[PDB]
Amino acid sequence: VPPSLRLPVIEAAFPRQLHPYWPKLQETTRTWLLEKRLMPADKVEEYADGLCYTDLMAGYYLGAPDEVLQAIADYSAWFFVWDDRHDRDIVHGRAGAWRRLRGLLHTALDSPGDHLHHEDTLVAGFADSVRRLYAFLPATWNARFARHFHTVIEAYDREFHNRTRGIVPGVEEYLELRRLTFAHWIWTDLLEPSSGCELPDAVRKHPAYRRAALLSQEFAAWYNDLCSLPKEVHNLGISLITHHSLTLEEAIGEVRRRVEECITEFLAVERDALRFADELADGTVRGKELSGAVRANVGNMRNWFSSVYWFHHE
């Protein structure tokens, strides 16, 4: 809605979608936060009720089973909390507290059960949400998710050593890192349980599927940095200003153009990926299943765009 944060293409071409389960989603999530004691009451209130953070997921994973959606939103809520601890350990120098948390998250990620009632709340909460996401598809999917999140936490570690030492990463260095601390591939994985199917490595690694999955995440990551730029360390504008010596009203234009480019590139590959889907329906049953899944996944990749865009303006 602000002029400098406005994207006419999103407004004209990416209608908001809202999952039917959204009302209960907020409730069950705020309830869960209290259950697991991951956050003070006041903060829970403003997270799920005040700023309705579960709406982010509710405009994203359309067609997801209610229980799958709930699991996702819990994870995302936990994520929020972890993101707050990370930030806190940083402005405290709690490198010991942080390192041990890091080691434990790695541990829990591989064996969630053993950690459901672990002393550290953040750890037990995480382990519950992970354990729940692990109950929808084959262990191969579960294994891929862990392999992806292991990297995410390591990325969060490097960002820790970046923001203490006060190291502003190179332009490309950050871009690579953000794909990780933003958990691009976790979200991409979570599309699959939503559509009730683990895509074969072949299907999900098709140039169009993977490029579409990527642009969706880039847009979300870079629009995030655009909104938060004037505020200010980690941000695409900050990296541009520091290493390309760009100015604010310059780095703001560059990030903005890069965001706009994600939209129009996605429009292009989106079409490639839906062609791909059409082709997957060979006539067989398994084929029609693979076609619908990819299609629902591309649709949610498209939904991320409006979900993230409109979330920021509310």
UniProtKB/Swiss-Prot annotation:
<dbReference type="InterPro" id="IPR054543">
    <property type="entry name" value="IsozizSyn"/>
</dbReference>
<feature type="binding site">
    <location>
        <position position="87"/>
    </location>
    <ligand>
        <name>Mg(2+) 1</name>
    </ligand>
</feature>
<dbReference type="GO" id="GO:0010333">
    <property type="term" value="F:terpene synthase activity"/>
</dbReference>
<dbReference type="GO" id="GO:0052680">
    <property type="term" value="F:epi-isozizaene synthase activity"/>
</dbReference>
<dbReference type="Pfam" id="PF19086">
    <property type="entry name" value="Terpene_syn_C_2"/>
</dbReference>
<keyword id="KW-0456">Lyase</keyword>
<feature type="binding site">
    <location>
        <position position="224"/>
    </location>
    <ligand>
        <name>Mg(2+) 3</name>
    </ligand>
</feature>
<dbReference type="InterPro" id="IPR008949">
    <property type="entry name" value="Isoprenoid_synthase_dom_sf"/>
</dbReference>
<comment type="function">
    <text>Catalyzes the cyclization of farnesyl diphosphate (FPP) to the sesquiterpene epi-isozizaene.</text>
</comment>
<dbReference type="GO" id="GO:0046872">
    <property type="term" value="F:metal ion binding"/>
</dbReference>
<protein>
    <recommendedName>
        <fullName>Epi-isozizaene synthase</fullName>
        <ecNumber>4.2.3.37</ecNumber>
    </recommendedName>
</protein>
<dbReference type="InterPro" id="IPR034686">
    <property type="entry name" value="Terpene_cyclase-like_2"/>
</dbReference>
<keyword id="KW-0479">Metal-binding</keyword>
<feature type="binding site">
    <location>
        <position position="83"/>
    </location>
    <ligand>
        <name>Mg(2+) 1</name>
    </ligand>
</feature>
<feature type="binding site">
    <location>
        <position position="87"/>
    </location>
    <ligand>
        <name>Mg(2+) 2</name>
    </ligand>
</feature>
<feature type="binding site">
    <location>
        <position position="228"/>
    </location>
    <ligand>
        <name>Mg(2+) 3</name>
    </ligand>
</feature>
<feature type="binding site">
    <location>
        <position position="232"/>
    </location>
    <ligand>
        <name>Mg(2+) 3</name>
    </ligand>
</feature>
<comment type="pathway">
    <text>Sesquiterpene biosynthesis; epi-isozizaene biosynthesis.</text>
</comment>
<feature type="short sequence motif" description="DDXXD motif">
    <location>
        <begin position="83"/>
        <end position="87"/>
    </location>
</feature>
<keyword id="KW-0460">Magnesium</keyword>
<feature type="binding site">
    <location>
        <position position="83"/>
    </location>
    <ligand>
        <name>Mg(2+) 2</name>
    </ligand>
</feature>
<comment type="similarity">
    <text>Belongs to the terpene synthase family.</text>
</comment>
